[PDB]
Amino acid sequence: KLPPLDHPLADIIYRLEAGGALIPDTPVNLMKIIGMYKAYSIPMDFYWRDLLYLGERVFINPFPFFKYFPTKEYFELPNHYAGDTADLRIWRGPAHAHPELMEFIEKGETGKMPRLLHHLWHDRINMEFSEDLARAMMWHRMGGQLDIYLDSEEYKAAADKAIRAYFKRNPLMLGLYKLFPDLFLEQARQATYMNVLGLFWEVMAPVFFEISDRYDEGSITSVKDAMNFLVNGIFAIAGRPIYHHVYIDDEVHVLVPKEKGFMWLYEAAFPYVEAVFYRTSPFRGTKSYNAQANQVPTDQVDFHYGILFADKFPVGTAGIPPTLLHQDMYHFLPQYLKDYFHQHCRGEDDILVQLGIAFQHAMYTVTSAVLQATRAAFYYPLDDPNPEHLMANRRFFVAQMDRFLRPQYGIAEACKIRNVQDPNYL
């Protein structure tokens, strides 16, 4: 409806204006996407439980030695909407846990052993990747509008009460909190960000559950329909609350209240997409933090190290965080993707590398769903006859694609797009 403008990335904008598909829409491109969602949703289903366990039960533990062993009832914790007593009821299936995740907790990759022995012999769910994300949303300040609330006079008082109620047994810690009151007060903030991230993955795990079932039935036929299901699920849950609710012995301390008006879109979805998909503090085995070699940026706005910019061939090597997720997202693979990988480069040997490239593909459509939801929320739909209402959408898409071209620190020589559009990138 509009003329072609100038961009080197213009071939993508014409696809965003007309429907969607930040990446091409071939069937082989969507099989891997839905399989990667199914593979990424089960470790996510453990992540959102363990992060809540950290934010409520391990509030500020000096020695949280275990810290990855949620209580028996946090696997029975009702996912707020998957079952009968749901809240918005997506993913029809049971709302307590996943049989596949419970099986992996039970038997692991070796056999039916006690959970502690499943931890020492690694055989685990690599929970350290979910904590790294939670610590990456903080330190970027990207929590949303509660970070400004997470400062003083309502939080410092509630955090003080909670801390004084938590350490009441040992006077060593109590005395320490008296000397340095801001030592455990910044560890309280960390538990709050853990709770926020764990509340974000209580929405995406059912979404990624249900999208695989929709693909199984046959309701999903093209990437456009997948991202549209994602956008609909995004708008459906954009109003759910965010809170902390630290639980101590026979007591609950309202740390950030539900009555403050923090919602899921502006405090856990948008500040997350920019933190983990875009910023994701730089890799340790790819860039030099050397302060003289001006390689890592000085402002946090130019951190181009997220999944959208990541380099997935060195996966499984030293100094690269995302490997922790790809080993975590490897044994929960559907069969039609294991068969798709086994007939390819290096077979079932380098399966982590291609498994990560497919994850990059999937996260591209997730962020495209975020882009479409963003424009449908703050701008005009595609079926708009007015020309200025269509130029607004074009300006928004050009701005959001300019984030992929800014040549500050090779930010344009990263950015795996125009590389994901290639069918020979896998």
């Binding site: 012999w121 730089p282 790819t286 030293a318 100094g319």
Partner: protein, 600 residues
């Protein structure tokens, strides 16, 4: 025990082969953690063994023993191990430090898949360190000294996908290899003179020796230049500035390798180096120059990890000075205290880095209120390095004032001065990372989890007990108190640290401070442009002539071998025309055959 202490370097050498079971191409399932766990187990068991062996040799004489590596015609390669007190004590020091750094790595190296490659190389240092402190043969004190060079190459180059590591690991291997190679020339020319290399036959030899002055001058200069490069001393010091790629071997390399790899070889060579009073003055010169340079350069740094490695160079130059005054006891004592303090310092800096991603001193700010431990640990590691006679590093740097004042006074004038600049560096490293206004990069700094601040606090206790651990057992270091000099080091250090605190916690000066002379600020900041020096003097030469030689080989030699062939081709291609195809010409040649042989 104490009769099987020589098995300590094998425990870790058993962890350096087992940890590779978990490298990402062997397990491919459930990998990355029990390798580090079992390496920690091995290190703990080798530390218990060493502690017991030290207790058992409290009041006993050194019980040497030895095996035979090979006995070819002329030489008899003897591998002797000494079980003296300072050997098992150094074994405790090495194994406890490796335990601290490995418990640290358990916390730091999460979100990292290479633990096979990391902990196997960390086990090959703990084994190499033990084999270096046990074995007291100048020959086998070089074997492991080179194996550790190779290990440093693979350890710095841990994450090789970073283009500044494959350049730092290159320099760290070449610079440290050249020194270890002139040390080979030195150990090679000490056999015809002493008939052995056992650190005891050498001692007896140096006792009664009357050989040429310049000969021992040269061989001791080589024996110097070995540890000179191994200990990151001028001019072989750029490798340490670039060996700050890969945190916490840096907590162990700058702290347990650099301290007892070349300094250990340099101290046990005191009898030999005493033979020439020119190697000693050169030793003083190198030590003092590198001390002054390291302190002045550390003051002018912006990277917190490189504002402590130059201090490592300086405090190893201090050991060079001490061993230059024929004082090996002071060096053996100071290594312990300095190593403890620098371990605390590096662990605190690593803890700050892990959660405050930047390393720029210009981007880190107010952390004291929200991060106490990591700050007090840095402060105690600071006080246990220069001054505060309470803390233990004072004692060994007190005798080196008395000794440098008794003889050769100007050297003391450095040791005193080295105590204020090195105090102004740490000062500005504390007042920049823990004091001042808080900045974007560190706006939300949570304190680190249990495995990164346990070793740090457990190693912060050792430093506080060191002074009192030298009271229960009368290990007097500086005999004559003479408080006139004990009140000099403290004044110098406190003055340096105080001016540092005033310049940065004073808000009475622009914070990106500029020097009245701008040209020297960006000269200390780029370590006197040492790379531009290397690429000019050695590399530029070794490269140039290289590009000549190959070209020569490709042009003059090869061509000279081909010309013959080519000529023999031409001589055949332009002599077939002698068969002209005309029978009358053939009869002419037959007739020219005759009447010529008839003439001859």
């Amino acid at each position: 025990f104490a009769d099987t202490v020589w098995l300590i370097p094998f425990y870790s050498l058993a962890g350096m082969v087992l940890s590779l079971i978990w490298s990402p191409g062997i397990t491919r399932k459930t990998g990355p953690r029990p390798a580090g766990y079992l390496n920690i187990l091995l290190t703990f068991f080798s530390f218990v063994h060493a502690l017991l062996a030290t207790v058992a040799i409290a009041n006993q004489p050194p019980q040497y023993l030895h095996w035979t590596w090979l006995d070819v015609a002329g030489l008899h390669l003897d591998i002797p191990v000494e079980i003296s007190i300072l050997t098992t004590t150094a074994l405790m020091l090495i194994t406890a430090l490796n335990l601290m750094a490995q418990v640290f790595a358990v916390g730091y190296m999460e979100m990292d898949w290479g633990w096979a490659r990391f902990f196997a190389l960390l086990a090959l240092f703990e084994g190499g360190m033990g084999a270096l402190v046990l074995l007291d043969s100048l020959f086998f004190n070089y074997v492991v000294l080179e194996i550790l060079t190779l290990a440093t190459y693979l350890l710095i180059g841990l994450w090789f996908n970073q283009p500044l590591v494959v350049t730092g690991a290159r320099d760290a291997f070449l610079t440290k290899r050249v020194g270890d190679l002139v040390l080979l020339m030195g150990v090679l020319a000490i056999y015809p003179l002493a008939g052995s290399w056992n650190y005891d036959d050498l001692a007896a030899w140096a006792a009664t020796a009357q050989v040429n002055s310049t000969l021992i001058t040269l061989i001791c200069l080589a024996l110097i230049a070995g540890p000179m490069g191994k200990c990151a001393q001028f001019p072989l010091h750029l490798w340490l500035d670039e060996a700050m790629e890969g945190p916490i071997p840096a907590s162990i390399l700058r702290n347990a390798v650099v301290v007892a790899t070349g300094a250990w070889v340099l101290v046990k060579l005191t009898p030999v180096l005493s033979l020439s009073p020119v190697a000693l003055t050169a030793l003083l010169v190198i030590g003092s120059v590198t001390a002054l340079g390291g302190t002045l350069i550390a003051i002018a740094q912006v990277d917190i990890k490189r504002a402590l490695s130059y201090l490592v160079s300086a405090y190893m130059g201090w050991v060079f000075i001490a061993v230059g005054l024929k004082e090996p006891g002071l060096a053996f004592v100071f290594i312990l205290t300095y190593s403890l303090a620098m371990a605390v310092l590096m662990m605190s800096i690593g803890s700050i880095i892990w959660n405050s991603v930047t390393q720029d001193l210009r981007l880190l700010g107010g952390l004291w209120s929200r991060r106490p431990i990591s700050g007090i640990s840095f402060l105690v590691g600071s006080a246990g390095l220069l001054a505060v006679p309470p803390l233990a590093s004072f004692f060994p740097q007190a005798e080196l004032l008395d000794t440098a004042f008794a003889q050769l006074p100007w050297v003391g004038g450095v040791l005193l001065l080295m105590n204020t600049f090195a105090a102004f560096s740490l000062g500005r490293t504390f007042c920049l990372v823990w004091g001042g206004e808080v900045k974007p990069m560190t706006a939300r700094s949570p304190e680190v989890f249990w495995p990164m601040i346990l070793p740090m606090t457990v190693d912060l206790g050792l430093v506080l007990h060191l002074p009192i651990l030298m009271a229960r057992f009368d290990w007097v270091i500086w005999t004559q108190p003479s408080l006139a000099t004990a009140a000099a080091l403290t004044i110098t250090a406190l003055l340096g640290w105080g001016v540092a605190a005033w310049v940065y916690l004073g808000k009475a000066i622009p914070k990106p401070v500029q020097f009245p002379l701008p040209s020297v600020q960006n000269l200390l900041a780029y370590d006197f442009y040492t790379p531009k020096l290397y690429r000019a003097t050695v590399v530029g030469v070794v490269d140039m002539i290289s590009r000549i030689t190959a070209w020569f080989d490709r042009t003059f030699v090869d061509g000279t071998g081909n010309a013959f062939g080519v000529v023999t081709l031409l001589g055949g291609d332009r002599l077939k025309y002698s068969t002209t195809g005309q029978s009358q010409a053939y009869i002419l040649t037959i007739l020219m055959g005759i009447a010529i042989l008839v003439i001859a």
